[PDB]
């Protein structure tokens with residue numbers, strides 16, 4: 048199976064049993080298996096919400112609407128506090144039933160539809176596509192907020208800015224330029240350090256001395 | 265046996281011999297209201313494990329202390345956040361040589 | 365010259381506790397037995413909630429009346445309640461790591477109750493039991509600190 | 524101690540006559556007028572101090588109140604009388620003489 | 621990052637890292653090294 | 663015999679006499695102890711049996727189950743009404759600008775200039791025509807109320823009054839048998855209360871012509887002068 052960098056050897060806990068397993072856990076947060084199940088459900092939930100959020104920010108910035116980091120300060124039909132109140136009140140039951148569905152099944156569900164599948168298109172292929180698009184959408188939303196924090200523009204005005212001058216309107220010519228440049232450089236040279244770790248200790252997995260890892264075993 | 269004739273050592277009763285006693289512990293199950301017990305058993309379900317409670321502690325404490333540094337020490341109006349509000353002890357480097 | 369009060373513990377003069385009125389007076393033993401620490405049949409999570417409510421309500425007072433912001437009128441209670449919340453969180457972490465450290469051996473010796481009937485071991489003194497005890501302690505402590513703030517806000521004669 | 528194998532529950536041998544007789548033996552003599560008090564008594568001045576301090580009910584007594592003197596002397600003698608009464612009752616009942 | 625030499629820390633960096641290094645990292649470290657030292661060899 | 667914490671009902675595990683007061687022959691009745699002869703067909707196996715068939719309309723069991731159906735449907739509709747009658751008035755006294763928050767004049771809001779602002783906001787519903795509103799209402803309600811009697815997309819072979827599948831019990835409160843049987847009589851008692859209160863809303867709108875929360879405030883201000891008797895002289899025949 049493909050990996051997060053070419054020729055990567057996966058950790059002993061990321062043995063490809065789950066989907067999206069590109070062997071990515073350099074911090075070994077998924078050494079515990081129940082933690083890994085909870086983290087998979089959390090990955091897919093963060094990703095579902097970021098999918099909806101990315102498409103929503105896109106639909107909002109596509110038309111003449113307030114910017115997504117200023118849309119909360121607009122005036123609405125309800126007061127702020129009652130909005131938050133009803134939100135908490137309904138999400139109480141919603142997330143309670145979702146947590147119950149996780150405890151029962153191990154996957155998500157709406158309220159009682161353990162598998163929210165009106166149109167029965169559930170598959171492992173569709174699961175992998177949901178996971179992949181959800182990771183992509185988490186990255187996309189992070190980028191929305193980040194290049195709306197450097198600039199005062201949302202997704203597509205910044206995209207048009209990059210398309211206007213690709214060499215001069217990019218992340219390395221903005222205020223966060225240098226740190227992203229050095230970060231990208233380190234991330235490019237990192238896998239060879241990791242591959243040295245794998246090479247000079249052939250077959251021997253190493254423990255990185257982390258608190259969540261229980262490295263004394 | 266144990267409790268009579270000053271026979272303070274019995275192999276069949278090693279708890280009374282060694283002193284493994286519950287001086288005050290009672291084993292009664294009828295303490296709390298079952299609605300309240302259900303509430304407070306359900307309210308602790310997500311943290312009833314060691315690693316999960318340590319995760320909540322880490323999250324909440326990192327967040328509390330980070331937002332303390334960002335807004336809370338200012339909301340508390342700590343002097344380190346307000347600054348000196350004066351010239352300070354700049355020009356008085358010493359009693360002899362008043363350095364900056 | 366009769367009627368000696370001080371007795372050895374459970375009649376055993378070699379264990380070394382010397383049952384004494386402060387130890388084993390009827391009212392004192394009644395009070396200590398009724399405390400949620402010594403209710404070895406109830407779930408440890410609920411006893412932890414009760415203990416934590418008490419301790420989180422009491423330890424807000426010092427931070428409120430003696431903290432660094434004790435003299436600013438309205439910021440005092442907020443500051444002290446946040447401080448008590450932090451201390452309760454620290455104590456909950458302490459309890460969790462204590463449950464990690466202590467409960468690994470499962471000692472096989474039984475427990476009696478000063479009257480002969482071999483009671484069971486308290487589920488509190490088990491890893492899962494102490495995990496849920498610390499969970500209950502966190503929940504109850506934060507709730508008790510919050511209610512201490514509430515009582516500063518709503519009580520009539522709160523000076 | 525070959526005996527005392529259970530820590531008896533009646534460790535204090537309660538005779539309800541003891542507190543009554545101690546309160547009576549201290550307080551009734553505590554209501555005898557002496558000219559050092561100006562013709563008044565220790566317990567009478569004590570009840571008067573409590574009356575004046577009950578007027579301003581929330582705030583507590585002062586330091587120069589002279590209420591504390593009456594309280595402390597009355598309770599010294601009272602606790603001594605009750606203590607020696609219990610001792611004497613359970614010394615006459617038991618042996619000890 | 622900042623104008624001039626980049627990688628100048630923010631103004632709020634002390635206010636964050638001094639509490640971290642002093643309240644958080646010592647908590648993590650002492651907890652980890654407590655669970656390590658009370659751990660029993662199987 | 664029984665200790666103090668059991669009399670308060672601390673322990674919800676050993677409660678088996680909870681349905682004894684609402685089902686079975688030893689239950690509460692309509693006139694209490696002043697109702698001896700319970701009707702012999704109202705045996706108490708259904709929720710809301712207080713032994714009240716004084717007009718005798720439900721002696722036959724088929725008529726009785728049709729009347730039970732009508733009672734529960736009217737109960738749920740009046741519950742939704744009595745929640746949906748006061749809450750525009752509650753949100754107008756909150757400060758949300760609903761322009762005609764009384765329920766008996768809310769239908770005329772669609773004949774205004776700006777149509778029917780939902781929460782007083784043009785960003786909301788903003789429905790202008792009463793005709794398309796009633797058309798989509800009769801289409802949607804025909805589909806739903808026709809799905810109700812013989813099943814449909816949200817359950818087919820379920821009970822005609824209590825389906826409770828994945829759509830009508832999504833929170834799952836009625837999984838337990840005793841909890842479902844207790845919340846049945848809770849439902850029908852809240853529904854009879856709301857049916858009585860909706861009849862009160864109808865009569866209060868007819869003879870006073872003001873808001874029900876306005877009626878509540880005019881009774882809270884003056885209870886003895888502003889009762890139902892100060893409007894008793896409003897239908898005198900001249």
Ligand code: CHL
Nearest residue numbers: 689690691692693694695696697712714716851854858894
């Ligand atoms: C022992 C005393 C006792 C009495 C007197 C009543 C009385 C009543 N209960 Mg009952 N209950 C009693 C015990 C208990 N009830 C209940 C639980 C219930 C429930 C759940 C219900 C009742 C209902 C009723 C009513 C049934 C008959 C009716 O509809 O009258 C109708 C006739 C009148 C009330 C008299 C008319 C009113 C007025 C005095 C005369 C008209 C005045 C106007 C000025 C006239 C002008 C109008 C003109 C324009 C035409 C009746 C008022 C039912 C109800 O509420 O119906 C309304 C009902 O649903 N009871 C419990 C719990 C187990 C009891 C325990 O002891």
Ligand code: CLA
Nearest residue numbers: 186187189190193194197205206208209216217218219221
């Ligand atoms: C969904 C992924 C995604 C995509 C398609 C883009 C695309 C773009 N970004 Mg955004 N960005 C992202 C994620 C993404 N970014 C994230 C996660 C961050 C947080 C670090 C940012 C932060 C950011 C800033 C601060 C700036 C941009 C800018 C830009 C533009 C120029 C590229 C550049 O200099 O940034 C390079 C981006 C990174 C180094 C971030 C990591 C990107 C990852 C590796 C994904 C790369 C794309 C992926 C392989 C395939 C995309 C899927 C599909 C659309 C084809 C371009 C429109 C610049 C711009 O428009 O200025 C005019 C700019 O100033 N981005």
Ligand SMILES: CCCCCCCCCCCCCCCCCC(=O)OC[C@H](CO[C@@H]1O[C@H](CO)[C@H](O)[C@H](O)[C@H]1O)OC(=O)CCCCCCCCCCCCCCCCC
Nearest residue numbers: 103122123124125137138141156157163781783784785786
């Ligand atoms: C498994 C699937 C689960 C799906 C659950 C249902 C999700 C429903 C999301 C909300 C959809 C409502 C849209 C109705 C049509 C509006 C068309 C329109 O013109 O919009 C127009 C509106 C804007 O219009 C504005 O309305 C405001 C309302 O006060 C103001 O009045 C403004 O003046 C007006 O301009 O656009 C939107 O509001 C779109 C927002 C949609 C997302 C809202 C946040 C929800 C995010 C969490 C979702 C939680 C899901 C669980 C809770 C529900 C459980 C049943």
Ligand SMILES: CC1=C[C@H](O)CC(C)(C)[C@H]1/C=C/C(C)=C/C=C/C(C)=C/C=C/C=C(C)/C=C/C=C(C)/C=C/C1=C(C)C[C@H](O)CC1(C)C
Nearest residue numbers: 714715716717718739740743746747765768857858860861
């Ligand atoms: C039991 C018995 C017994 C004996 O024997 C005999 C007899 C007497 C006969 C019987 C009795 C009966 C009765 C009482 C009946 C009654 C009923 C009712 C009242 C109902 C209501 C009923 C009521 C109802 C439905 C109601 C409903 C409601 C609804 C829909 C809604 C509404 C609304 C709203 C939201 C508001 C807006 O703005 C509009 C509207 C639209 C307006």
